Design a protein around this ligand. Structure first.
Ligand code: NA
Length: 123
């Protein structure tokens, strides 16, 4: 069922992480969050497994919210497989935030790449 390099649990948790962050966003915004997870895996500055990236303490509200082991939203799951298949609409982003609600002081310091739906994607 799952791309080589990933477990069933990897894909489910990615889908649940993506739904947590981007439920209701344009489909492109959901692929984008998935893209960011894969970019963080690649990056030296984040963990180097999908689990490690998803379980970073503040990172994905699906973790704190008890959603990471649920049956995944089918569209968030498609977005995940789209990103694994090489769709990265964020231009290799590592960070994102919603400028209307974000309360982080430091997020505004990241170099901004583009905005998709309610999220600005950043290096
Ligand atoms: Na990494």
């Amino acid at each position: 069922n799952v791309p080589n390099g990933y477990s069933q649990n990897d894909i489910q948790m990615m889908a649940n992480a993506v739904y947590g962050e981007s439920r209701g966003e344009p489909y492109l915004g959901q692929v984008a969050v998935a893209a960011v997870i894969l970019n963080r895996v690649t990056s030296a500055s984040f963990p180097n497994t999908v689990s490690g990236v998803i379980f970073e303490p503040r990172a994905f509200t699906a973790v704190a919210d008890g959603q990471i082991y649920l049956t995944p939203n089918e569209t968030a799951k498609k977005a995940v497989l789209d990103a694994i298949n090489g769709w990265d609409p964020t231009g290799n982003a590592l960070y994102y935030f919603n400028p209307d609600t974000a309360t982080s002081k430091w997020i505004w310091t990241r170099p901004q790449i583009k905005k998709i739906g309610k999220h600005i994607f950043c290096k």
